[model samples]
Target: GPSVFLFPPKPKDTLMISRTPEVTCVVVDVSHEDPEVKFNWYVDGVEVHNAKTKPREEQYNSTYRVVSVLTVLHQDWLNGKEYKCKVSNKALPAPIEKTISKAKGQPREPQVYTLPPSRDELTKNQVSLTCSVKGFYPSDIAVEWESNGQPENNYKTTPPVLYSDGSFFLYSKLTVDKSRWQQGNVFSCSVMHEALHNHYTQKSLSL
Candidate 1:
């Protein structure tokens, strides 16, 4: 009956509240059939009681998605105190544990650049442009593509990946008609992140 106590999902981070952008909060979600579930929160190995866990009714079936919330003070979170959570279910041999911690030190801005299509693509019916964002932190970012100063309707953005040093990188691609690219359209990539002082830093490339 391994399905009796399914493993909890990774903790979801609430990047920060805009006006008060330093406080840290995490929501740990667990979906299970058993109604009896317990949660224990810890900070740097020290147990912290009073963490809130709320069971939610599944809209389509007889299941529960428990939402466990833990808040860390701005000062301690900024200092990167590792926060851990333990979930208990009666049938499980051991309690399940998950950990989360904010990145310490100054948040770094991402280097933004746009990549043009290959020569073959320029001669084909369509071309692809890529926007590269490298070396950023906090995991909150936005990327957009535009053509001729107008917002593009279609594009695909890759998931942001974390590096060993705790920074993140992502790439976005936009495909447009080759005829339009040859017609002299300017393509732009705009990236928005807190590291950029809440500005949408953009990079553009021309054919």
Candidate 2:
């Protein structure tokens, strides 16, 4: 009639926060049965009875996963107050808790680089420009490819990869037409992360 789960079935630290107005804390419950669940919200160890809560349910084969969200306003957290979401379910050995606080600051700027097409690729009439960024935080970023000093749209970007240290990595590539490469064109890759503020980083290569 009941199931047991391991410790930290819920998030412990702040997962991710955007440069927006709201902060949210989430709790997850997974069990083989439809668990009887309850949620509680708190700010600075004081309970928030009227907090806004959202619950999402999903089915994975014979088991069920439930996600609970508790949202708070930026002004409420501006005083450096702590927010916590506590979850209880019959399937859990104990109540699972998750918390979030005001963000410290923007993440460090990413290391940006470009990998030009190889000699073999050039000889085969296939050429491309690749741009990569590593060790960035906050996750949101903008990447662009330029050709001959002007912005170009013939490019593709890969989904960001998250590192173990809470940093993120991403890459984009532009496949130039064979005719374009034969003409010896110049290309560049530019990256914009929150940490860069009003500026961005770019790398250029000639082919």
Candidate 3:
């Protein structure tokens, strides 16, 4: 009795590699001594023609490992049908299936916005600036704070979360002194993501 795992872990983890590829890999690691489990891969509901499950290799992690790969034309992976992977165990109630669509491989640019601390925050001699990046795809990004375009220190960013549309969002916070805020200095939130062409997009806020 072994479990199934897709490499890169989440659905969005591997799609960025779609740029040029033989294909995505669905990895299978089994814990039991019996190496009976095999991976099934399909494209657009049709069993892939040139797709295959490479030979299983023994791993020191007390497991059996094998990889299932699809041979998709660079053009077809994006314009073609949905791709799928399955883990079927005869003793189980049903076969488990995971499908990947071209949409997952597609990218969506982010919408960056800044939220300045409220009046109450300023009066307390403490204030914070917030940067929110939303609706971006691939779930990989870098968010940082800058004071007059120079890196600011002491900030925390949360892990990115998923969207219903397969996009993602997250917030970063930078707390600064009220004295600095009232000085009319500029604070910016910049993000680097795969969706954008390394443009170093940012949103700025000032008193």
Candidate 4:
């Protein structure tokens, strides 16, 4: 049988404890059914080993899983530094690394803008609507265009682009006939990203 290992999922890779008086940071590395697996912890790029390091084994699917945890003090973590765990296993091409740090940077809700059709386009009985979404992080978001409460299918979107500040930008355009635009139809661009918390950011343009 084949075995695998994975790091636990968190909404963001970074964790912050600045508001807490005392905080303990834990980084875990797990390997499946690899008794020979080992883990190493690093703080600010320096190897760390002490009583705060702990390893445990458990059974799953008729095999074994080992979990190693490294605990560190918040004060030490507050130096605007990084903490990482390196895991080694025979099945992997190279050592697996997981990192965490104080939540100094987090994705923000996208700033959205909608551009209405131009005069020449309206005169030609055609309209184009563009939505610009900027300054979002994680590079994952959904942009949609709608007219008169119905989804617009004929549209094009650009791939997410990286910004200098470690954020992302996306552009989407919707084109339709001017008759639909001049009929007092509602046009909206809705943006969906994790930062919005179950709500969408939208911008609208009217004729």
Candidate 5:
């Protein structure tokens, strides 16, 4: 009996591109096809060599070829850049290519101030605090200021407006007495999204 039913096989692997201000992680899933498939990565149309990490396989998911984590090092975070993922398997007629942008996994979200700014000690009196987060998509970010990690005594500053180009920016401000600042009060600025706080802080001042 000839086999008339040819079930379309699933994809041998799937890949996802994730990036940060400092690093870029390119992940690929290779499980079903092993000897027939290989992993390749490209950045800005340039091929990366000497990257000797092999694609990992999954224990449960046989249909996936798993690459734990492959990172790309860039000098500066390419603002408004485009990244593509290409996967090739012996079974497939051609490679699968998908565009990877910052928008993937909310990549374009505002950058919170994780590291506080350094201020002068003598001029620390009558200190003025500012919070700035940029390169956001959809332009809707919730920003807040905190003293000693407490939300109270914080202020809600206005969101940033767009410019001629297509980039988003937001900022906030908090003014505290010189004596309070000199007393070494930890002040923080945070941006909230997806119910998470991406925070930045400026440590207390000292005479």
Candidate 6:
């Protein structure tokens, strides 16, 4: 008799979190001997109710193009958040390891975002130009606004706020004074989050 490794492949499901607000999408594969697979969604290990299961066409952009929908609570799609999905066969010995990934829109660096431009000289008195980088993981992230060796004089970081979801967003503010702009001051928003800092700094001012 030869030694055999039985890799009972469970129904593979492709779950790619979406960025669209109020929308949760998932792909499930029911092509297995035990077609009776149950799908569940959890937040920090707590089962989520809004995660309704449905059947859909191929996934938008995923490795496995399957025909099942693993819904997510739109309320839980806030940036810098995480979600989990568990699909198991009633006949399997053990449920597959709970699979999880962060919830975010599939966007690359410099993602299409809209933010107020550097405060104009006209409104310097009324409102100072501000730059903030938010919706990121890890609370100790750093934000910097520097230009030509002179950095923002009054740069302050607001305390990080945590929502019901498991994520962190730091609110930092910088005063865009007229004195700095006329002096050819360039303002930039840079986020430094441990190992992922290099991946987030995309938008910067030209010298």
Q: What overall lDDT goes with each candidate model?
A: 0.67, 0.64, 0.69, 0.64, 0.45, 0.43
Worst-scoring 10-residue span by lDDT in model 2: 6-15
Q: lDDT per residue, candidate 6, 66-113, as tens digits?
A: 222344443343233355555565545665434444334432222212
Q: Which candidate wins on lDDT?
A: 3
Over 4 Å off, model 6 = 1-114, 117-121, 124-127, 182-184, 195-202, 205-207
TM-score against truth, every candidate: 0.59, 0.52, 0.52, 0.50, 0.38, 0.36
Q: Write the per-residue lDDT of candidate 3 for residues 10-64, one digit (tens) a residue.
A: 2222234544344445444555555665457776777766766788787788777
Question: Is 4 or 6 the stronger prediction by TM-score?
Answer: 4
Candidate 2, RMSD to the unseen true structure: 6.9
Residue-wise C-alpha lDDT for candidate 4, range 78-189, written one tens digit per residue = 3346766776667668877777664455657788988887777778866788899998866656788886788889889899898898888989999888888888788889
User: Which lDDT tens digits does candidate 1 get at residues 1-207?
Assistant: 213222221212223343222222222233354557777777799998756655555545545555666655644654567777676766568877776676566778889988889876676776888898999876667788887678998799998899898888999999888777777888889887656754458898777
lDDT of 1: 0.67
Off by more than 4 A, model 5: 1-36, 50-55, 68-70, 79-81, 102-187, 190-207
After superposition on all C-alphas, the RMSD of every candidate to the true structure, in Å, is 5.9, 6.9, 6.7, 9.9, 13.5, 15.0
Clashing pairs in 3: none
Question: Which wins on TM-score, candidate 3 or candidate 5?
Answer: 3
Candidate scoring better on lDDT of 1 and 2: 1
lDDT of 5 at 164: 65
Q: Which stretches of candidate 4 lie over 4 Å from their true place?
A: 1-105
CA lDDT, candidate 2, residue 112: 89
Candidates 4 and 6 compared by lDDT, better number:
4
lDDT of 4 at 146: 88
Model 6 collision count: 1
